[PDB]
Amino acid sequence: MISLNGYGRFGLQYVEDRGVGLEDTIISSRLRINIVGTTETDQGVTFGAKLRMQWDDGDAFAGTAGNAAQFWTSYNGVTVSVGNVDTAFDSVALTYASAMGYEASSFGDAQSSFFAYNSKYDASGALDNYNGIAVTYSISGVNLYLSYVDPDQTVDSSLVTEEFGIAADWSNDMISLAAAYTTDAGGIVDNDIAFVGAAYKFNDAGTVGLNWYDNGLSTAGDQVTLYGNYAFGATTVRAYVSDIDRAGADTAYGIGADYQFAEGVKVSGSVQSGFANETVADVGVRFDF
Amino acid sequence: MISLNGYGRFGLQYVEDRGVGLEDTIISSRLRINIVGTTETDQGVTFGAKLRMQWDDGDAFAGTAGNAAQFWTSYNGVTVSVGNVDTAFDSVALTYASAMGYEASSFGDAQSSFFAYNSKYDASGALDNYNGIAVTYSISGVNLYLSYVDPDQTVDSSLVTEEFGIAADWSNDMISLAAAYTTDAGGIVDNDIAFVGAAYKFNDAGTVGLNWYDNGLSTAGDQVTLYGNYAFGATTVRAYVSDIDRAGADTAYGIGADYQFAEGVKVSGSVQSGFANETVADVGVRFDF
Amino acid sequence: MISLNGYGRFGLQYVEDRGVGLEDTIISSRLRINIVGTTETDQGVTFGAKLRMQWDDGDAFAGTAGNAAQFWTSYNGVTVSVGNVDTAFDSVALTYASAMGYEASSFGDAQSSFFAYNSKYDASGALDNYNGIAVTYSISGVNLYLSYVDPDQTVDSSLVTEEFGIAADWSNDMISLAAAYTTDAGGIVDNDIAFVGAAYKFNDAGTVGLNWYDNGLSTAGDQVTLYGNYAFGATTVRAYVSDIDRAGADTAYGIGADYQFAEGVKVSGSVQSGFANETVADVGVRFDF
Ligand SMILES: CCCCCCCCOCCOCCOCCOCCO
Ligand SMILES: CCCCCCCCOCCOCCOCCOCCO
Numbered sequence: 039m040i041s042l043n044g045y046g047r048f049g050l051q052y053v054e055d056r057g058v059g060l061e062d063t064i065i066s067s068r069l070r071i072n073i074v075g076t077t078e079t080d081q082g083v084t085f086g087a088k089l090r091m092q093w094d095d096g097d098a099f100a101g102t103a104g105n106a107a108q109f110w111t112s113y114n115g116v117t118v119s120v121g122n123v124d125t126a127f128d129s130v131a132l133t134y135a136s137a138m139g140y141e142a143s144s145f146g147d148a149q150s151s152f153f154a155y156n157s158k159y160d161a162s163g164a165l166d167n168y169n170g171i172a173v174t175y176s177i178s179g180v181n182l183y184l185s186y187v188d189p190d191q192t193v194d195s196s197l198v199t200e201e202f203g204i205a206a207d208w209s210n211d212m213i214s215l216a217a218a219y220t221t222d223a224g225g226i227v228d229n230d231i232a233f234v235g236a237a238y239k240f241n242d243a244g245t246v247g248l249n250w251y252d253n254g255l256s257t258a259g260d261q262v263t264l265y266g267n268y269a270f271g272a273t274t275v276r277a278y279v280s281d282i283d284r285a286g287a288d289t290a291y292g293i294g295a296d297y298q299f300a301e302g303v304k305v306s307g308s309v310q311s312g313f314a315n316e317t318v319a320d321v322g323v324r325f326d327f
Numbered sequence: 328m329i330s331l332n333g334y335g336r337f338g339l340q341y342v343e344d345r346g347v348g349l350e351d352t353i354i355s356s357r358l359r360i361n362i363v364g365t366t367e368t369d370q371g372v373t374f375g376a377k378l379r380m381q382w383d384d385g386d387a388f389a390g391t392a393g394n395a396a397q398f399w400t401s402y403n404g405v406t407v408s409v410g411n412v413d414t415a416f417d418s419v420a421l422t423y424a425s426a427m428g429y430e431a432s433s434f435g436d437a438q439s440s441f442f443a444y445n446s447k448y449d450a451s452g453a454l455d456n457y458n459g460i461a462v463t464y465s466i467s468g469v470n471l472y473l474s475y476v477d478p479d480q481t482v483d484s485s486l487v488t489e490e491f492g493i494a495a496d497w498s499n500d501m502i503s504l505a506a507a508y509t510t511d512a513g514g515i516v517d518n519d520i521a522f523v524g525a526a527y528k529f530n531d532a533g534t535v536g537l538n539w540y541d542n543g544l545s546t547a548g549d550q551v552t553l554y555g556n557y558a559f560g561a562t563t564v565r566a567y568v569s570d571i572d573r574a575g576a577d578t579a580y581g582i583g584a585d586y587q588f589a590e591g592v593k594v595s596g597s598v599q600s601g602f603a604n605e606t607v608a609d610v611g612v613r614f615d616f
Numbered sequence: 617m618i619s620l621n622g623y624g625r626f627g628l629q630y631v632e633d634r635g636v637g638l639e640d641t642i643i644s645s646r647l648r649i650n651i652v653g654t655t656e657t658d659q660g661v662t663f664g665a666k667l668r669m670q671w672d673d674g675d676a677f678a679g680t681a682g683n684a685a686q687f688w689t690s691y692n693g694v695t696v697s698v699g700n701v702d703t704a705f706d707s708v709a710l711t712y713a714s715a716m717g718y719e720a721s722s723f724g725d726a727q728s729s730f731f732a733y734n735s736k737y738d739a740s741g742a743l744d745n746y747n748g749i750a751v752t753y754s755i756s757g758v759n760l761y762l763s764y765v766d767p768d769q770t771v772d773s774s775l776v777t778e779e780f781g782i783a784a785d786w787s788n789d790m791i792s793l794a795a796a797y798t799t800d801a802g803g804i805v806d807n808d809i810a811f812v813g814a815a816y817k818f819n820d821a822g823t824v825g826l827n828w829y830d831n832g833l834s835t836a837g838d839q840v841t842l843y844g845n846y847a848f849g850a851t852t853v854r855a856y857v858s859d860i861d862r863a864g865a866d867t868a869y870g871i872g873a874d875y876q877f878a879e880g881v882k883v884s885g886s887v888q889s890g891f892a893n894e895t896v897a898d899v900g901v902r903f904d905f
C-alpha cells in the first residue's frame with residue numbers, strides 16, 4: 039500500500055535588521071509531502087519505507103526533490119529502522135516543547151549540533167553514504183530510543199566518528215519526564231550532549247516545564263529553558279525564557295499563541311528575542327492534508 | 328487529502344530547416360503530474376497547496392523534479408494564492424484561444440514577456456526567491472484576476488522591479504469579452520502590456536474571435552489575431568491569422584484539427600507559418616489521467 | 617487514473633577486499649517508487665505513462681528525483697511504447713533466471729553492454745535526447761519484442777549509431793525457450809549480441825536451464841550459464857555456474873536461497889564467485905507495496 043500525507047504553511051517572517059539591502063519581513067512558506075509505502079503481513083511484522091519531498095522558500099533552483107530513504111520493520115511495539123533514521127536526541131518527548139509560532143521555532147530549544155532525520159537532499163555530498171540504524175520500543179507510557187549513525191559507512195569505521203544516542207521518556211496523565219544522551223553528536227569527536235526535562239500538567243488547561251541541557255562542545259554551554267502554555271478554548275498561549283552559560287549572552291524569551299481554526303488548520307504567531315538580542319516575529323497558518 | 332492528476336502527450340514535431348545536422352522531425356512528448364493537497368473546513372474555508380512534476384523531451388539530465396510550491400486559501404468565490412502563482416495576463420480567458428495542434432502552440436498568442444506559473448525548477452537560480460500573491464474572484468459569468476510578483480522578495484523592494492497585473496473576463500452563452508493589463512511585465516521596467524479580446528459563438532458549432540495586444544517593449548509591437556474554429560461531431564477544425572507591427576514581418580497563420588477520440592483522449596495536428604516565415608507542423612495525442 | 621506501486625529492500629552486501637580503507641560489508645538498500653498514469657477508453661485502447669523515483673545507498677547528493685518518461689498505447693495484445701522504453705534484449709524471458717540474493721545479482725547474466733529502461737536521471741547529459749520506440753505482442757504463450765533506440769534523436773540519424781533489437785520467448789507448462797538478437801547494442805557500432813536460452817521444469821518443484829550468449833565486442837566473449845532452482849515449501853534454493861571465453865577467467869558460480877516470508881515479503885541471500893575470483897555475498901529483505 040502507498041500513502042501520501044503532508045502539510046503546507048505560509049505566513050510572514052520578520053527578523054529585526056536582517057541585513058543591508060534585505061527586507062526584514064518576507065513571506066516564508068513550506069510544502070511537505072511524505073510518501074509512505076508499507077507492507078503488512080499476517081505474522082504481525084509490518085515493513086515500511088518513506089520518502090520526503092520538501093520545499094521551503096529560498097530553496098536552490100526553485101525546485102523540489104526527494105531526500106534519502108528510510109526503511110523500517112515493526113513487531114510487537116518494537117521498531118528497527120535503517121538509512122535516514124530519526125535519532126534519539128531528536129525524537130525524545132519534551133525537548134521541543136517550548137517551540138512556538140507558525141514555524142515552530144524557539145531559542146529555548148537545545149543549542150547543540152547533532153544528527154537528525156534529513157528532510158532534504160544535500161548538495162555538498164556530505165550525506166552521500168550517511169547511514170543510520172535506530173531502535174525504538176514503547177513500554178506503555180514509557181518510550182525508549184536508540185540510534186547509531188555512521189556518516190560515511192563505506193570507509194573503515196576506525197577512520198570516521200560515529201554518533202551514538204539513547205533516550206527514554208515516560209508519562210502518566212500529569213507529569214512527564216524525559217532524558218537523552220548522545221556521544222560524538224553530529225560526528226564531532228567529544229561533542230557529548232545530554233538532556234533532562236520534566237513537565238507538569240497543572241490542569242487539563244495548563245502545563246509548565248523545564249528543560250536542562252549540556253550542549254557539549256557548543257559555544258553556548260549548559261542551558262536551561264523554562265516554558266509554559268495555557269489553553270483557552272481554541273486558543274493556546276505559550277511563553278518561555280532560556281539562559282546559556284556563554285559569557286555575556288542575554289536571556290532569551292518568547293511569547294506566542296495558537297488558534298485551532300478547524301481540525302488540521304492552525305494559525306500561529308510569536309515574538310521572540312534571542313541570546314544576542316536578535317528580534318524575531320512571525321504570524322501564519324499551517325494546514326495538514 | 329492528497330490527489331494526483333495529470334496528462335501525457337506524444338507525437339511528431341516538425342520544424343522546417345531546424346539547423347545544420349539537426350533532424351527536422353523528432354518525437355516530442357511531455358509528462359505532467361500535479362500533486363494537490365487540500366484541507367477543507369466546516370467554516371467553508373478550503374486551504375490548498377500544489378506541486379508539479381513535469382518532464383519534456385530534451386530536458387537536462389533526463390530527469391524530473393518538482394517545481395516551487397503554490398499555496399491558496401478559498402472562501403465564497405474568492406481565492407488568494409501565494410508563492411508560485413498564476414498571473415492575471417496568463418490566466419484571463421480568450422488570450423490562448425487560437426492555439427492548436429497537440430502542443431497547443433500558436434504564433435497568434437501574445438508576443439510579449441511576462442511572468443507565469445513556473446512549471447519547473449530553473450537551474451540559473453533566477454527564481455530562488457521569486458514570490459507572488461494573486462487574488463481571483465468570480466462574479467457569476469464575470470471573472471476578475473489580480474497578481475503581484477516580486478522576483479526576489481529577500482531584497483529591499485526599491486531595488487527590484489515588481490510586476491503588477493489585472494484582468495477581467497465575462498461571458499454569456501454567445502459573446503465573451505476579455506481584457507488584461509500588466510505593468511513591468513516580466514520584471515522589465517516599462518514593459519507594460521495589454522490585451523483586449525472578444526469572441527462570438529455563432530452556433531453551438533462555431534466561434535470566431537479577435538485578440539488585440541500591446542506587447543510592450545517587445546520587438547513585435549502591437550498585434551492582432553483573428554481566429555475561428557468549427558466542430559463537426561468529434562472533430563474540431565481551427566484556423567488563425569496574426570499580424571505584428573515589426574517592420575517586414577510576414578503574416579502568421581495556421582490550420583489544425585482536433586479529434587476527440589474518447590473522454591480524456593484527443594488527437595491533434597497542425598501546420599503553421601510564423602512571422603519570419605518559419606514552417607512548423609505537428610501531429611499527436613494527449614491523454615488525461 | 618494515477619497509481620503508485622514499488623518496493624523497498626535493505627540487507628548486508630559483502631565484497632571481499634573491496635579496497636584500501638573501505639569496509640567490505642555495508643548496508644545496501646533501495647527504495648523504488650513507480651508512478652503510473654493510465655487512461656482507458658471504451659474503444660479498448662488504453663493509453664499510459666509512467667515515471668520512476670529510485671533511491672539507492674551511495675546516491676549522489678543523498679536525494680531522489682524521477683527519471684525520463686515512458687508512454688504507451690495498448691490494444692488487443694499489442695503495446696507500442698515511446699521514450700524511455702524497455703528493450704528487447706533486456707525484456708525477454710529466461711535471460712535473468714540465474715539471478716539470486718536480495719539484490720538479484722548474477723555473474724551468469726549476460727556480460728555485454730546494451731540499452732535498457734533507465735531507472736534514474738544521468739548527470740553526464742548523455743541521455744538528454746535519448747528516445748526509444750518499442751513494440752511488444754503476446755501470441756498466447758508466445759511473446760514477441762521489438763525495440764529501436766536512438767541515443768540522440770535531435771541529430772541527423774546518419775551521424776549517430778541506433779540500436780535495434782528483437783526477441784521472442786515461448787512457454788508451455790514445462791519447457792521454455794527464449795532468443796534475442798540486438799545489433800549496435802548500446803549505441804556501439806558492431807557490438808552485435810545474441811541470446812538463446814532454454815529451461816525445463818522437471819517438477820512443479822524444480823527447474824534447470826541453460827543460457828548461451830554472444831557478448832558482441834565485450835572482453836568476455838561467448839558465455840554459457842547453467843542454472844537451477846528448487847522449491848522446498850516456502851524456501852527456494854538456487855545455484856548457477858557460468859564460463860566465458862576470456863583467456864584465463866575462472867568459472868563463475870553462486871548459491872542462494874529465497875524464503876517467502878509472506879505475500880510481498882522475501883528474504884534472500886547468496887554467496888557468489890566471479891570470473892576474476894571476486895567473492896561476493898549478501899543477505900536481505902525486499903517488501904512490495
Ligand atoms: C532541488 C531540485 C532539483 C532540481 C535541481 C537540478 C539542478 C540542476 O542544475 C545543477 C547545476 O547545473 C546546471 C544544469 O543545466 C541546466 C538544467 O535545466 C535546464 C533544462 O531543463
Ligand atoms: C532535473 C532532475 C534532477 C536531477 C538533476 C540532478 C542533477 C545532478 O547533477 C548536477 C551537475 O553535477 C553533477 C553531479 O554528480 C553526479 C550525480 O549522479 C550520480 C550518482 O547517482
Ligand SMILES: CCCCCCCCOCCOCCOCCOCCO
Binds near residue numbers: 103161679
Ligand atoms: C538527485 C536528487 C536531486 C538533488 C540534486 C540537486 C543537486 C543540486 O546541486 C548540484 C550541484 O551544484 C550545487 C547547488 O547549490 C546548492 C543546492 O541546495 C541548497 C539549498 O536548498
